[PDB]
Amino acid sequence: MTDNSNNQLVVRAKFNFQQTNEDELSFSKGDVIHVTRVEEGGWWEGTLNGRTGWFPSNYVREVKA
């Protein structure tokens, strides 16, 4: 509404990634994740249904419908 503008960066899971705790974000081929902090190459943080935490940028790719 305020911070989120100029089209949000949407990313889609590539490979089946496994989490370790509620601190890390889990995702499987298909589950979409909304980025909240996108840096210049590295680790990206996002949110998912019942799953919230950090996620790699190499196992995910910027998706756009």
Binding site: T20, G41, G42, P56
Partner: peptide, 22 residues
Amino acid sequence: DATPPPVIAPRPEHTKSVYTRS
């Protein structure tokens, strides 16, 4: 399709890594 050799984002000894991750 072409899979990239570099798997998972890089994780140095500094900057990243917080409260230990797995």
